[PDB]
Amino acid sequence: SPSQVRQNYHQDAEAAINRQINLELYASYVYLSMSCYFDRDDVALKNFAKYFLHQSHEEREHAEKLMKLQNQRGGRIFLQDIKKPDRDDWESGLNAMECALHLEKSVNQSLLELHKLATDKNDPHLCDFIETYYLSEQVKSIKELGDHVTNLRKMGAPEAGMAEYLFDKHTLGH
Amino acid sequence: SPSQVRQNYHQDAEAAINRQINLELYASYVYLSMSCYFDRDDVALKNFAKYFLHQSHEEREHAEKLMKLQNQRGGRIFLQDIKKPDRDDWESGLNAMECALHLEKSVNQSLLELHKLATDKNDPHLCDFIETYYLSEQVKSIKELGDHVTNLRKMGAPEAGMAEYLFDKHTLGH
Amino acid sequence: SPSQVRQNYHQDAEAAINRQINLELYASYVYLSMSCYFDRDDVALKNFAKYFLHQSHEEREHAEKLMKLQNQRGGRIFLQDIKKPDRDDWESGLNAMECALHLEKSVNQSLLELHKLATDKNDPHLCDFIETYYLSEQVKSIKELGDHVTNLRKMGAPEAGMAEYLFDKHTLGH
Amino acid sequence: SPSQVRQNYHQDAEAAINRQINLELYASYVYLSMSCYFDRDDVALKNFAKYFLHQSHEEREHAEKLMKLQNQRGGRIFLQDIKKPDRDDWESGLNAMECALHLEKSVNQSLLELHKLATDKNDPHLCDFIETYYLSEQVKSIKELGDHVTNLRKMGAPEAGMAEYLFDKHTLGH
Amino acid sequence: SPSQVRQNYHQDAEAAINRQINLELYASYVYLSMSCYFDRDDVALKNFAKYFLHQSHEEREHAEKLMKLQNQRGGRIFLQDIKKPDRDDWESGLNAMECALHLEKSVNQSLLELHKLATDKNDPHLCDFIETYYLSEQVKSIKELGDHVTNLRKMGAPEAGMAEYLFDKHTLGH
Amino acid sequence: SPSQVRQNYHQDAEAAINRQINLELYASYVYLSMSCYFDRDDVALKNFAKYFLHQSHEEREHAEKLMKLQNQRGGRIFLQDIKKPDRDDWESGLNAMECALHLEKSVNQSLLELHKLATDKNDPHLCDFIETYYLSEQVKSIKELGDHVTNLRKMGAPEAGMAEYLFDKHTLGH
Ligand SMILES: [Fe+3]
Ligand SMILES: [Fe+3]
Ligand SMILES: [Fe+3]
Ligand SMILES: [K+]
Ligand SMILES: [K+]
Ligand SMILES: [K+]
Ligand SMILES: [K+]
Ligand SMILES: [K+]
Ligand SMILES: [K+]
Ligand SMILES: [Mg+2]
Ligand SMILES: [Mg+2]
Ligand SMILES: [Mg+2]
Ligand SMILES: [Mg+2]
Ligand SMILES: [Mg+2]
Ligand SMILES: [Mg+2]
Ligand SMILES: [Mg+2]
Ligand SMILES: [Mg+2]
Ligand SMILES: [Mg+2]
């Protein structure tokens, strides 16, 4: 008994969209963990915390947009557990940026697999949705994170004590 | 003797674009018929008539955009008869919404076949045009019509006399 | 079983109004064909295309006003096929203007026959509607088209290459 | 090795705050599931979906405020899995409101246990935080949900088809 | 040793992007040559010169956007010589427009080959970038140039002395 | 067959102006290469990239002003290949600034030779043009680049990791 709006929407695509929803929610949760780490009194990097809180909210928005797509196409959303992040302690601004880069590249790889599936199922609307709202955003975010990692490494983080402080002020405070 | 601007524009794509122009014009004409049905003194649902008149004008705009694409790519527009709609009497707001949903899904299926043809002919500009201006609009319209059908059915239309009146006021009057 | 609003509205007038609706829709379609002809890369007269697109939209508005009259008087709208225009290629700005003049005079003749019928059936409201909204507009349009034809002919169109270019800039660009 | 800011902050309170963070995140996730249910084409109650999306965002904000408290007091945030909601299909607006009322009363009971623990540990700052930011908000939300449930039941939901439609327009659309 | 941001970016695509950068820079240089030709005291067509200077700056912007893409994806930009244009003397406004049309169609063919390569390498981000920022712009520019060529030819350029003067005033001066 | 506007404009000066046009275009291309180097994810100095992009655009403007002079005096512009820059990798902000200083001093030496030629040919208009639009600008740019080199060296660039980061923020970010 398919939805009255469903058209050219393969069941495999519906399942993959549900998986991507869970992945975006997990990414939001990871970014939230990082943000709270930098709010610690013994870390105390306010702009790192703000940066990762903003990333967390953006990932949640991505998840919600995918749910809207799922309903728009007549798919049915099936939520799963949002697993806790791998770490409680992210150990430095540089390490958190590197972990964020790894996470964003994993999310991008998932979106590329999703696009490959949509191409295989001849779903141009789903392909276009992924390209328009996800792929370019992912490439921009990956480039920005790589830039941050490069600058933190060059400045001497985490060993150079002033590196993360000044990067927090100059790059993330503006 | 091809057009001086023609490049990577297959004759099959040109023909399919002409067919799609006729289909959009036909859809506009169907929506016009519906709008006039709800303007009848014995139907008298002003916001249904306004909704379908707006849909008719939008379909005409879609047709004109396709003609602009045809000229932009060096194709030649060949117009055909615009067939009269299948019905003169659309019998209820719920029935007209259901017929509109059927029509929009048929138009979407035609656009998906058109996109498949453009992909087969390796015409990325035509593919991108269809995705950007037609596919997402079609999915949005299909979802909106499905929502209207669901609400009208739940409210008890057409048997429940106040259903279409109140839906006209609350959903289509805002 | 006549409409509850029907009064002094002869069946012959209702049928003639339906025929006039089809004629106005056909005129709109002819003007659309002309507009698209002047959008061709090998014709490329933007203001001719704009002029005829505006005429097409005006004719559609005339058709819709007639449908509103049909419902207002308790008549029932019966749509027919909108026949494709006689030509795909309109061959020049002067030729398109001459064809438009011929079309507008045919539409005017139909409206005059309609007014004669309304007078014969003693339908003063229908007579007044035709006079107020259609007859003066038709005479103005016929005079404007005749003026355009005269100017294009005097300038040397279509043989004089700059004639249609300069007429497009000066008369239709302002 | 306690935090340099830690003062009068019992380990039991820290653990209970972590549990409350997980509960608020779970509540946000439940509300998100409800919001997406009402976005379905076969449910199509836009203002119910908006109401529950707003509730989801508010619960996330509550979770984040608790994390800020945890860091402010020198506690350490330990995140856990966010369990998926008990249902995918919430079956009606009335049922979703009743489930939301049950959820909010469970969250309130958890906050009351948390306040009892803070009183037992003589932590007036934590007590005041719970009272100021959580208890009154919970009582207001519980009262609002009870009001919605009462009105939906009186209107005849879900059996009365127009009940949830009109409640969506009048109570949740303003 | 790939870039830390590189993902799903084939070496062939990187090389093709470098080639496209050189092609856009070359196109900018050709347009600059044309602009300077129309600034000559013995040609003296100011709006032709302005048109081609604007085209030159636009092509440079296209090149810079491609370089930004190359860095964003982790590719490495390798610049090559920018070859001088084929002509110093462009001989007339009509001839320059025809040469510009030929150049733009060659650039479009290169972008279509680039899109084919990206499709073959399953690089949806690169495909979408080409479609979004290059393909539609190319089709629009080709259509505009074809229109200019048609109008100049019809007006009698270059033999008709007033043709290019009046086209410079009316089409390129507005 | 000299130009109708040509007066007191030696052929040697015309040739030297053509050479200077090529040199300015080459300088613009070198600055573009530098700008793109600092946009790399593994360099990631945004304000260095902005500084050199601005320099590239300024050099292009200088080239265009020279072409305007060439036409104004009745000379004929003859474009040549724009050679690729000597390096793809500029290795550091300090090294790029030093290379830019070397380039600007070479351009200044060329302009001084050009002024010497114009003085020898008794061309006061060309002399005044070089003095007014080129010589003072060159001295200002050379002084600014020398200042940047001095500051980067004193700060410890490139060995001191924070040197180029902070110089990018403080000197080039304001
Ligand atoms: Fe500083
Ligand atoms: Fe009501
Ligand atoms: Fe004129
Ligand atoms: K730590
Ligand atoms: K009926
Ligand atoms: K023709
Ligand atoms: K249900
Ligand atoms: K010449
Ligand atoms: K390097
Ligand atoms: Mg995301
Ligand atoms: Mg696309
Ligand atoms: Mg349409
Ligand atoms: Mg008319
Ligand atoms: Mg709460
Ligand atoms: Mg108190
Ligand atoms: Mg270009
Ligand atoms: Mg210079
Ligand atoms: Mg002087």
From Swiss-Prot, chains A, B, C, D, E, F:
One of its GO terms (molecular function) is ferric iron binding. Residues 7-156 form the Ferritin-like diiron domain. It comes from the Eukaryota. It catalyses: 4 Fe(2+) + O2 + 4 H(+) = 4 Fe(3+) + 2 H2O. Keywords: Acetylation, Cytoplasm, Cytoplasmic vesicle, Iron, Iron storage, Lysosome, Metal-binding, Oxidoreductase. It is found in: Cytoplasm; Cytoplasmic vesicle, Autophagosome; Autolysosome. Fe cation 1 binds at E24, E59, H62. This is Ferritin heavy chain. The gene is Fth1.
